[PDB]
Amino acid sequence: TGLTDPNTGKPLNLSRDELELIRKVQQGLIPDDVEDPYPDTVEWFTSVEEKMPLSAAPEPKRRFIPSKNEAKQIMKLVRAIREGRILPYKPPEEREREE
Amino acid sequence: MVKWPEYIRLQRQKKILRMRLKVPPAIAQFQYTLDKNLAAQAFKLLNKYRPETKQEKKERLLREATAIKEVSKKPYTVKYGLNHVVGLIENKKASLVLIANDVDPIELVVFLPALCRKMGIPYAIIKGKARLGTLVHKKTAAVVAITEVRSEDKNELAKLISAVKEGYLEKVEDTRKRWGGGI
Amino acid sequence: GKVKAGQLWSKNKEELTKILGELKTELSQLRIQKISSSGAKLNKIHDLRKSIARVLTVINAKQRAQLRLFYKNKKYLPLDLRPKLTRALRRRLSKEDASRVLEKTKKRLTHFPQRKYAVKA
Amino acid sequence: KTHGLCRRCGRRSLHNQKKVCASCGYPAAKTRKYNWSEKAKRRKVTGTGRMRYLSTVPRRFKNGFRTGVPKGAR
Amino acid sequence: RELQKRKRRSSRPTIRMPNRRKKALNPAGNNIIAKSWNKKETLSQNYTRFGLVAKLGK
Amino acid sequence: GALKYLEELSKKKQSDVVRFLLRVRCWEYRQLNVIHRASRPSRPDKARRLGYKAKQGYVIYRVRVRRGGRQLKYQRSLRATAEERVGRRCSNLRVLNSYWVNQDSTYKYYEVILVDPNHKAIRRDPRINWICNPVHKHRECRGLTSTGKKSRGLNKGHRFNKTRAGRRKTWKRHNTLSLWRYR
Amino acid sequence: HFRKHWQRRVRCHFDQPGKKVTRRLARRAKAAALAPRPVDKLRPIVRCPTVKYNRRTRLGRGFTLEELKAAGIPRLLAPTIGIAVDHRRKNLSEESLAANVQRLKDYKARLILFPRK
RNA sequence: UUGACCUCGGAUCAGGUAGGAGGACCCGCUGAACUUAAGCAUAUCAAUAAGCGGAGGAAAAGAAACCAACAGGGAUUGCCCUAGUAACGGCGAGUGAAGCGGCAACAGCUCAAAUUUGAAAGCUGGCUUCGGCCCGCGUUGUAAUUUGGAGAGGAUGCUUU
Numbered sequence: 003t004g005l006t007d008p009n010t011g012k013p014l015n016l017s018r019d020e021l022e023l024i025r026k027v028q029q030g031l032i033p034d035d036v037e038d039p040y041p042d043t044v045e046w047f048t049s050v051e052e053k054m055p056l057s058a059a060p061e062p063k064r065r066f067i068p069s070k071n072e073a074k075q076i077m078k079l080v081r082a083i084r085e086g087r088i089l090p091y092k093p094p095e096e097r098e099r100e101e
Numbered sequence: 102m103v104k105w106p107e108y109i110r111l112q113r114q115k116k117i118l119r120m121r122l123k124v125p126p127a128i129a130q131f132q133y134t135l136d137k138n139l140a141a142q143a144f145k146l147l148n149k150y151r152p153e154t155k156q157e158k159k160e161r162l163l164r165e166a167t168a169i170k171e172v173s174k175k176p177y178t179v180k181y182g183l184n185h186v187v188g189l190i191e192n193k194k195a196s197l198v199l200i201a202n203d204v205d206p207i208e209l210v211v212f213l214p215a216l217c218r219k220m221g222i223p224y225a226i227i228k229g230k231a232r233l234g235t236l237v238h239k240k241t242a243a244v245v246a247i248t249e250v251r252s253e254d255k256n257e258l259a260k261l262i263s264a265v266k267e268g269y270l271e272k273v274e275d276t277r278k279r280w281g282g283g284i
Numbered sequence: 285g286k287v288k289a290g291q292l293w294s295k296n297k298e299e300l301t302k303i304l305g306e307l308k309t310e311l312s313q314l315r316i317q318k319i320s321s322s323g324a325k326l327n328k329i330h331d332l333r334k335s336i337a338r339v340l341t342v343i344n345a346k347q348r349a350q351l352r353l354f355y356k357n358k359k360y361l362p363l364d365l366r367p368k369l370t371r372a373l374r375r376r377l378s379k380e381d382a383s384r385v386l387e388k389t390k391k392r393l394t395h396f397p398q399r400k401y402a403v404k405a
Numbered sequence: 406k407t408h409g410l411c412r413r414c415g416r417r418s419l420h421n422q423k424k425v426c427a428s429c430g431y432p433a434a435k436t437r438k439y440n441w442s443e444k445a446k447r448r449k450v451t452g453t454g455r456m457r458y459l460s461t462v463p464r465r466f467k468n469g470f471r472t473g474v475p476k477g478a479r
Numbered sequence: 480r481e482l483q484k485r486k487r488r489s490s491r492p493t494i495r496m497p498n499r500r501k502k503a504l505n506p507a508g509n510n511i512i513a514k515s516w517n518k519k520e521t522l523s524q525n526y527t528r529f530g531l532v533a534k535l536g537k
Numbered sequence: 538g539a540l541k542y543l544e545e546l547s548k549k550k551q552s553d554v555v556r557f558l559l560r561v562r563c564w565e566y567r568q569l570n571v572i573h574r575a576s577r578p579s580r581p582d583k584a585r586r587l588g589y590k591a592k593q594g595y596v597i598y599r600v601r602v603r604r605g606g607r608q609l610k611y612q613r614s615l616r617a618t619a620e621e622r623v624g625r626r627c628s629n630l631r632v633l634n635s636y637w638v639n640q641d642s643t644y645k646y647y648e649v650i651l652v653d654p655n656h657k658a659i660r661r662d663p664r665i666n667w668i669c670n671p672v673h674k675h676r677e678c679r680g681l682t683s684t685g686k687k688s689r690g691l692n693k694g695h696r697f698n699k700t701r702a703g704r705r706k707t708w709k710r711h712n713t714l715s716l717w718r719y720r
Numbered sequence: 721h722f723r724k725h726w727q728r729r730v731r732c733h734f735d736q737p738g739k740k741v742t743r744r745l746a747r748r749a750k751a752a753a754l755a756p757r758p759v760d761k762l763r764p765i766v767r768c769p770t771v772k773y774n775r776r777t778r779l780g781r782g783f784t785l786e787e788l789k790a791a792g793i794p795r796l797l798a799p800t801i802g803i804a805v806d807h808r809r810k811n812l813s814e815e816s817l818a819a820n821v822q823r824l825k826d827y828k829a830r831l832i833l834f835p836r837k
Numbered sequence: 838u839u840g841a842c843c844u845c846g847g848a849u850c851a852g853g854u855a856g857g858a859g860g861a862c863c864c865g866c867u868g869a870a871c872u873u874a875a876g877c878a879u880a881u882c883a884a885u886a887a888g889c890g891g892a893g894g895a896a897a898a899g900a901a902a903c904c905a906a907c908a909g910g911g912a913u914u915g916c917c918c919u920a921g922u923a924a925c926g927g928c929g930a931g932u933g934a935a936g937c938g939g940c941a942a943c944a945g946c947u948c949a950a951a952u953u954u955g956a957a958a959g960c961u962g963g964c965u966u967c968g969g970c971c972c973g974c975g976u977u978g979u980a981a982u983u984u985g986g987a988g989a990g991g992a993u994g995c996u997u998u
């Protein structure tokens with residue numbers, strides 16, 4: 003009982019167990035007869051394009067200035083270099099004079 | 102005859118069921134994914150805006166700390182994170198959105214094509230949550246957004262946006278409201 | 285007959301294991317000839333047994349201390365060397381974990397701590 | 406004989422055919438105990454045996470479960 | 480009960496728990512209250528000497 | 538803010554996309570075990586508001602429970618039975634909370650959030666390390682979870698007079714003859 | 721009213737003299753820790769709800785936010801100087817407000833405060 | 838051909854954990870009869886005993902989807918009183934609270950709902966010269982900020998480590 007795909011596809015070939023598994027979940031998922039159970043979506047809300055941002059909250063000043071958290075991480079590395087625990091930055095040219 | 106393992110069979114039966122049932126038109130629109138050319142041209146721009154890795158972020162911090170022991174503008178990267186990107190959508194701060202087609206709780210991305218449509222931001226459903234994670238240095242990434250690019254490539258972003266609203270969103274227009282599957 | 289433990293702690297490992305062998309071979313040879321006229325030999329057996337225990341204690345304590353010196357930097361002590369305590373005491377939260385507090389809580393304690401005051405009559 | 410030796414409780418209460426003890430229930434992980442026999446509870450309760458390890462717990466608590474050695478000991 | 484009879488017959492010694500308290504009863508230190516607190520007078524009697532209020536209720 | 542969109546979706550769970558997803562997932566869960574491990578929650582908004590965190594130590598377990606009568610009625614809820622079976626399965630974890638995830642004509646499906654009290658990521662976090670205390674061993678057996686507090690009637694008001702401080706503690710107090718010294 | 725087993729659930733009170741000693745020792749143990757401070761926190765003066773006890777007046781739970789701000793005591797300082805604070809209670813009349821900002825003003829006059837470190 | 842991602846498994850791989858006991862007191866589940874009503878079935882017994890599950894030095898409860906009708910109270914718990922009152926009752930047997938009031942003790946908080954986005958800032962393990970290096974988790978969200986008698990963001994000026 004091959005039946006063609008509704009989206010203008012191809013006459014399908016699935017096994018009888020594959021067809022029974024489709025009919026099992028379709029019986030659990032069917033509203034009724036008579037009325038159209040599967041209508042198209044009328045975009046009653048996305049037809050109107052929103053032109054302004056949703057939130058009217060102010061933008062914080064931290065979005066316009068350099069990073070606070072990056073600054074605190076920099077000074078932690080400065081103290082490591084001050085106390086000599088972390089070696090300072092070596093450019094790739096100095097890496098070419100290395101291993 | 103031969104016997105197949107349990108998780109092996111269930112992988113195939115879910116693939117059959119998700120493509121042959123009467124799929125509502127918010128999951129059926131995820132079956133339509135952009136072309137190979139458009140995906141390649143998208144990742145040509147996006148790879149130029151890859152976020153810094155943990156190795157090279159640490160190197161730059163060591164560079165600036167060293168100069169203090171012994172001047173930049175805002176970094177333009179690729180925006181990721183579902184909660185972050187949805188907020189960038191809602192404040193109209195995004196210019197192009199890419200949505201993975203294989204988010205396995207699909208409820209995390211069902212509203213996302215329609216939300217981008219409501220605010221006017223061009224979107225494209227893309228193959229691979231793994232591909233986007235590679236672009237952004239994670240295992241996975243459900244959504245990827247571009248907000249602002251550098252001045253050297255404002256033209257090719259606007260060209261890529263026009264290639265989405267012509268090559269992808271025009272074909273989707275009268276087939277995103279229709280139910281998928283059938284039989 | 286009896287060996288004081290004060291002499292036991294001073295000696296090294298090979299001197300212990302030789303003396304322990306000397307007490308054990310002596311102990312075995314007594315019981316062969318103790319079955320007849322078990323008099324002062326029986327008292328010697330009691331003193332021989334106690335001296336064996338004192339020797340075996342010093343060898344074990346030296347070996348356990350050498351293990352605890354070896355594992356002084358490693359973080360996975362063997363089970364025999366870990367403290368016993370109780371079962372529930374070993375699954376209690378650590379002193380530093382239970383004293384750990386949130387950053388918001390520390391901020392309020394830093395700037396508004398409990399004061400010290402009095403009320404006059 | 407109806408009953409044989411039981412490994413757990415040491416009585417001759419293990420049924421031979423069923424292999425289940427009438428006193429403790431050896432194949433069961435739990436020891437058989439019922440609240441309608443207070444006399445049977447006090448016959449097998451803690452304190453009626455050797456108390457081989459639990460006798461050592463009260464002294465170690467009194468010292469705070471300390472570990473170490475006294476200062477200046479050999 | 481049957482545990483307590485075992486300890487009466489055993490040669491193991493009874494472990495006498497010292498009279499300890501979770502909270503100390505009398506203030507200590509080098510401050511003003513500790514150097515003038517009397518061990519044998521009550522809370523009300525001690526605060527009367529200090530001139531301080533102990534209870535703020537009725 | 539993707540999770541606000543998910544909260545409205547779970548409200549409308551008779552709708553087309555949610556009935557479809559609940560149908561295809563209930564089919565999948567029937568071939569699986571009675572109690573099995575889920576890598577991620579099926580409703581990530583619900584799990585997170587119930588306490589789930591993406592940390593090492595948090596696990597999600599999915600369980601199906603038979604539905605119907607015990608006309609004897611089991612005063613234990615199906616949710617409490619879902620908690621008790623998982624805690625027996627994972628005797629090393631602590632049941633934090635549970636929520637409805639699906640249902641069928643024979644079974645009801647719940648996802649339970651568990652926390653490892655021995656993982657030291659959990660032990661170091663002051664927001665969760667209360668569960669490492671041994672007064673929280675097997676909260677689902679003593680009725681200490683959200684299902685248990687509902688069925689024990691631990692609510693304020695004159696309606697819950699018999700049960701708000703413990704039902705058996707209230708009965709023992711009211712049935713005690715209290716004799717003083719100077720009567 | 722002895723239909724049930726009242727024999728198994730009868731409670732005597734021979735610890736009445738012994739519990740009083742413990743309660744007085746708990747107040748002495750608390751005052752050893754809080755040595756110059758009073759044992760109990762300050763509490764507001766409130767009116768009893770019903771028509772039966774409208775004319776009577778008792779101690780409440782804690783001071784309202786408007787009472788604290790009118791007296792001049794900051795909110796985040798009050799729990800640290802012996803003042804109980806109730807966020808649920810409202811004032812609803814000027815008589816409840818004026819009686820309590822007099823009480824807090826009287827507390828400050830009798831209060832001696834010592835610096836932090 | 839290669840390499841991801843997801844999902845499901847194997848391992849005498851490394852690190853952990855659960856069982857059992859005890860159970861006077863504590864938290865759930867399940868649940869009986871005699872008796873009384875001079876017989877007995879509703880009821881009582883009894884939301885008890887027996888049975889099952891799970892904790893601690895206490896447990897449980899707990900910071901109002903509360904009480905009230907006031908000139909208002911203000912998390913939870915316990916004592917006295919309310920009071921053999923209200924209420925329900927083969928309206929027989931009987932059963933039987935709570936609010937207010939005096940006391941004891943007092944303590945308040947953590948999340949989810951937000952974009953750090955000018956920088957996952959967070960965390961588990963391993964190797965460690967113990968100083969700091971790697972792997973992994975994690976964007977399907979780990980830190981900081983906030984928790985509705987609030988709060989955020991700017992601005993302004995004092996006050997705190």
Ligand SMILES: [Zn+2]
Nearest residue numbers: 411414426429
């Ligand atoms: Zn036995």
